[PDB]
Amino acid sequence: EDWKALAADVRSEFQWAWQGYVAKAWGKDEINPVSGTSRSFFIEGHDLGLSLVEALDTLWIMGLDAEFQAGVDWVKANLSFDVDGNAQVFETNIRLVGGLLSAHLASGDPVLLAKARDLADRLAKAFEASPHGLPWRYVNLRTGAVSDPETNLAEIGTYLSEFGVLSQLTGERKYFDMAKRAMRHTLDRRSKIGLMAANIHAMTGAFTSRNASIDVYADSFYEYLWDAWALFGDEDCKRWAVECVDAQLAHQAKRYDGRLWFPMVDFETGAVTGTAQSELAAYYAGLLGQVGRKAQGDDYLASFTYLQATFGVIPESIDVTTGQPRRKHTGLRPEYPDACLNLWLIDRDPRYRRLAAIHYREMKATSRAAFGYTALKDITTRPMTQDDNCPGYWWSEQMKYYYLLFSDTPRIDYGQLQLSTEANVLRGFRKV
Ligand SMILES: O=C1NC[C@H](CO)[C@@H](O)[C@@H]1O
Ligand SMILES: O=C1NC[C@H](CO)[C@@H](O)[C@@H]1O
Ligand SMILES: [Ca+2]
Ligand SMILES: [Ca+2]
Ligand code: NA
Numbered sequence: 001e002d003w004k005a006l007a008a009d010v011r012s013e014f015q016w017a018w019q020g021y022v023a024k025a026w027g028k029d030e031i032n033p034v035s036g037t038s039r040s041f042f043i044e045g046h047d048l049g050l051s052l053v054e055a056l057d058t059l060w061i062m063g064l065d066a067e068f069q070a071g072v073d074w075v076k077a078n079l080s081f082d083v084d085g086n087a088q089v090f091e092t093n094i095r096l097v098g099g100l101l102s103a104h105l106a107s108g109d110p111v112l113l114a115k116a117r118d119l120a121d122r123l124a125k126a127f128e129a130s131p132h133g134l135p136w137r138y139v140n141l142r143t144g145a146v147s148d149p150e151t152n153l154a155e156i157g158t159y160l161s162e163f164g165v166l167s168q169l170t171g172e173r174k175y176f177d178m179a180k181r182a183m184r185h186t187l188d189r190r191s192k193i194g195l196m197a198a199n200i201h202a203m204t205g206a207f208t209s210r211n212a213s214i215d216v217y218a219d220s221f222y223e224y225l226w227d228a229w230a231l232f233g234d235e236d237c238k239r240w241a242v243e244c245v246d247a248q249l250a251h252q253a254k255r256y257d258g259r260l261w262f263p264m265v266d267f268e269t270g271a272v273t274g275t276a277q278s279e280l281a282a283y284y285a286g287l288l289g290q291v292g293r294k295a296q297g298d299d300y301l302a303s304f305t306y307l308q309a310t311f312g313v314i315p316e317s318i319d320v321t322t323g324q325p326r327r328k329h330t331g332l333r334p335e336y337p338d339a340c341l342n343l344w345l346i347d348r349d350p351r352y353r354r355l356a357a358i359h360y361r362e363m364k365a366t367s368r369a370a371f372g373y374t375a376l377k378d379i380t381t382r383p384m385t386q387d388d389n390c391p392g393y394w395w396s397e398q399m400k401y402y403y404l405l406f407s408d409t410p411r412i413d414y415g416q417l418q419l420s421t422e423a424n425v426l427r428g429f430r431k432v
Contacts (some may be wrong), residue, residue: 033372157221194247286342
C-alpha cells in the first residue's frame with residue numbers, strides 16, 4: 001500500500017466534503033448531505049457553526065490552508081456565545097471549547113483563545129451550581145441557569161484536557177481545578193473493588209445506578225485521567241488512570257466465544273448487569289495501550305476487527321453473548337480508527353494502517369452521499385441504506401485519524417501529539 005497516496009485521497013475527500021458544507025450549510029451546525037440541507041445541534045434555530053469549528057484543526061493538519069482560514073475568519077466575525085438558550089455542557093466543551101483550542105494552537109490567533117475562554121466561563125456556571133462541583137448537564141449560555149443534574153461520569157469528567165489547556169494558556173488555574181475536582185468526587189467514591197457506577201447526581205453527589213461501564217455514559221472519563229497525566233504531569237491522574245483500568249480488567253473483562261468484551265457490571269459485586277457493547281467502546285482498545293496494557297488493547301481491538309470483517313460497518317451496538325447487532329442504524333462512528341491511531345503511536349506497526357484503510361474504504365463504500373458523508377439507516381441491507389446527517393464529530397475525528405495514520409505529515413510532531421476525546425489536537429503542532 002502507498003500510504004502517501006491514500007493520505008492524499010483522504011485529504012481530497014475531506015476538501016470535497018468541506019465544499020459541500022460551504023455550499024449547503026455555511027455557518028450551520030451540521031450538513032445533511034443527502035438532502036443538501038442543514039440542521040442545528042445545540043440550540044434549535046441558533047446554530048453555532050459546529051461542523052466548521054470541529055473541522056478547523058483537521059483542515060490545518062491537512063494543509064487545506066485557504067479552507068482553514070475561511071473557517072477561522074467566519075469564527076472571528078460571527079461566533080458568539082451570548083445566547084439565551086440551553087446548551088449541553090459536555091458536548092459544548094468537547095466540541096466547541098476543544099475545537100477552538102486546537103484551532104488556536106495551530107494558528108496562534110488570540111481571538112480563538114478568547115472565544116474558547118468565554119465559552120468555558122459560561123460552562124463554569126454549571127459546575128458552580130453544585131455544592132460538589134459536579135456540573136449540571138445543561139446551562140443557559142447567557143443567564144447561567146442550569147437544568148438536569150442526573151448526569152454521568154462522561155458528562156462530569158470530560159473537561160480536564162480542555163480546561164487544563166485553558167489554565168496553561170491563560171495562567172488561571174481555576175479551570176484545571178474545577179475539572180479535576182469533579183473527577184476526584186467520583187474516584188473518592190469507588191467501591192472496594194475499584195469501580196464507579198456510571199450514573200451520578202450533581203446535587204446529592206451520590207450514584208444513581210449500580211452499573212459500572214467502560215462504554216457510553218462513562219468512556220471519556222477514563223481517557224481524561226490518562227490524558228491529564230500526559231498533558232499536565234498530574235500524578236493523581238496517572239495513578240487513577242492505572243487503578244481504574246486495573247479494576248476494569250479484573251472485574252469487567254470477560255470472554256464470549258473466544259473474544260474479549262467489557263460488559264457492564266454491578267460496581268460493588270462485579271455481577272454482569274448487561275450484555276450490550278456499543279461501537280463507541282472501541283476507544284478503550286487504544287486507552288489500554290496508552291496506560292501500559294497493550295496486549296489487552298490489541299485483544300480488544302481484535303473484537304472490533306471481527307465485527308468489521310463480519311458486518312462491514314461495525315454495528316452501533318452488539319450483544320456480547322452472540323456477537324450480533326442490537327441496532328441496524330449507525331452514527332458514522334470514529335472509534336475504530338481512534339483505537340488504530342492510538343495503538344500505532346506506540347509501536348508504528350503497519351497492521352494498524354491496514355486495518356484503518358479497510359475502515360476508510362468501507363466509509364467511502366457505504367456513507368458517501370451527494371454533498372458529503374452520512375450516517376446509516378440499515379447496515380443489514382445491500383446496499384446499506386442511508387440516513388441523512390453528517391455528525392459534527394466526523395469533521396474532527398475519523399478523517400483526521402486516517403490522515404494522521406497515512407500522511408506522516410511534517411505539520412505534526414508525532415512524539416508530542418495529544419488528542420482530546422473529540423480528536424482536537426491539544427499538543428504537537430509544528431509551525432510551518
Ligand atoms: O459522547 C457520547 N454520547 C454522550 C455520552 C455521555 O452522555 C458519552 O459517554 C458518549 O461517548
Ligand atoms: O467522545 C465522544 N464520543 C461520541 C462522539 C464520537 O462517536 C464524539 O462526540 C466523541 O468521540
Ligand atoms: Ca471519543
Ligand atoms: Ca484518547
Ligand atoms: Na477539531
